[PDB]
Structure 1
Amino acid sequence: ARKYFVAANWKCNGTLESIKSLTNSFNNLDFDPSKLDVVVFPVSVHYDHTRKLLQSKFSTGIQNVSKFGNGSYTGEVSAEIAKDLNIEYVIIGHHERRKYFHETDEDVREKLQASLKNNLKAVVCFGESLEQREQNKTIEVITKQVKAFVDLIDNFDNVILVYEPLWAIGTGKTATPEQAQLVHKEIRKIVKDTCGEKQANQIRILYGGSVNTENCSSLIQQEDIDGFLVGNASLKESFVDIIKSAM
């Protein structure tokens, strides 16, 4: 069976005091890390603070990593630097970085390449917009997005995929668990035919839309949804209930 993966994307949020309060509630949850992956992604400057406060059962990572290695790149965090700090996970290709910060498919590839070279584990995001789905290009867009980086995967426990239904984010549309399931199933088929059957059966594919305490169970029960990249709900103490749904 696939090991489930519950991720907390805190995005651009948090204070030192609020993290102290949030991590303490998180630590109260008793789970086996050898059977369930739980990863917290704080702001870069909050990493050390968050890592020290969280118990070892919780994995930690950063929300972005440079496509560049060490050198003259002001404001950048390389995979080499992340490895030296023992940062385990990275987020690559989150739609907010594609939206506001010019991040392209080729940037995603170079980031994954750098991350894997430096023995980091990567949470790679992709998905189609409202205009793309309405034109029935869901499969085409995702195929293009996945194949941009998929060949680089050398360990299928170490790369985790995230489907972001951008057509349901910031719009009027709402994504159902089964609408996500059918996309997840197609993503896994792409991995199957590009990498292999065993490799596709190994890889975790997470839902990256809106996840809360009420819908997490209906999402996790789907055959091809192996967990979530959680946004706003991961900033609340009730995030422990979202973890419990995958336990």
Structure 2
Amino acid sequence: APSRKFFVGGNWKMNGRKQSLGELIGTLNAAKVPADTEVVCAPPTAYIDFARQKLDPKIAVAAQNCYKVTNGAFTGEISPGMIKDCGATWVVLGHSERRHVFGESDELIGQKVAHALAEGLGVIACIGEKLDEREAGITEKVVFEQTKVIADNVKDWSKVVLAYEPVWAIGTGKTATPQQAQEVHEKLRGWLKSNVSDAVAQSTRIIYGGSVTGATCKELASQPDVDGFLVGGASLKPEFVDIINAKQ
């Protein structure tokens, strides 16, 4: 469609009960959301439905992970169809904790992307290097290897978002500084041009994942190829509001 609609998704990780959640849902349901922005919220999985009942129709509910088949024997899992049945139109996949605390391989994240997309939930597929890789400067290969694999299982880019998360920027104000962010966002929108199509590159949202704070949010959203944000712990605090009102 015309110009890349700004995206701010907030991942609440395994934080919160219904009282803290209920109250945060009150702050959000009453913050001014610009039509500038498309906001999605990942609640913890015991509360995707709670959250969807309570939240305003204008904040999309997102699940934090899902599995590869519609229904099966896999205790502890959720499927896309259940995410859809609860009312959440998105799923967060390939997020770093899955990958590096719980070992989700790229072939699992492929298989998930593909299945989620078959069901008609939007994915935020996550990619990003650790410190040993930025050190070796092999950022290029490990963001690009990663995007080959998500991209190989995307069949219709309309529904997917890419979130660059440099692993080190999770959890400390150790952020990729605005130029750091954009070296790699640009290099990756360019990889999508090389390899997919100009219309995918042109229209795909690449959002920034790492430590977005109410401080950092406007300098960051001024890079040409940073399309919005994946907000970790700041989305749980009221400054989240400010991050929705970032690039204008």
TM bin, normalised by shorter chain, reads over 0.9
How far is 1:30 from its partner? 2.7
SS at match of 1:25: helix
Corresponding position of 1:116: 117
Following the alignment from structure 1 to structure 2, what is the Cα–Cα distance between the partners of residues 138 and 173? 17
TM-score, normalised via structure 1 length: 0.94
Which deviates more, 165-174 or 66-75? 165-174
| Partner residue, 2:4 | 2
What's the offset of the Cα at 1:124? Answer: 0.5
Question: In 1, Cα distance between the equivalents of 2:38 and 2:63?
Answer: 16
The letter for the 2-side match of 1:200 is: A
Distance in 2 between residues matched to 1:169 and 1:58, nearest whole Å: 23
Q: How does 1:110-189 map to 2 (within 5 A)?
A: 110-169=111-170, 174-189=175-190
Change (3 A) 1:12 1:171: closer
Distance, in Å, in 2 between the alignment partners of 1:113 and 1:105 is 12
Structure 1 distance, partners of 2:121, 2:173, is 37
Letter in 2 for 1:176: T
Equivalent position amino acid for 2:33 in 1: F
Match of 1:224 in 2: 225
In 1, the alpha carbon distance for the partners of 2:33 and 2:175 equals 32
Question: In the aligned structure 2, how far is the partner of 1:41 from the partner of 1:193?
Answer: 32
Give the alignment's TM-score, normalised by structure 2: 0.94
The alpha-carbon distance between structure 1 residues 50 and 84, as it changes in their structure 2 partners (threshold 3 A), is closer
Partners of 1:133 and 1:245 in 2: CA distance: 28
CA-to-partner distance for each residue in 1:180-230, whole Å, 9 max, x for gaps?
101000111111122101111100001111010000001101000001100
Identity %: 42
Q: Which amino acid aligns with 1:52?
A: Q
CA distance in 1, matches of 2:206, 2:173: 25
Say how many residue pairs are matched: 246
Q: Check conservation: 1:47, 1:62, Cα contact below 8 A.
A: yes
Unaligned runs of 5+ in 1: none
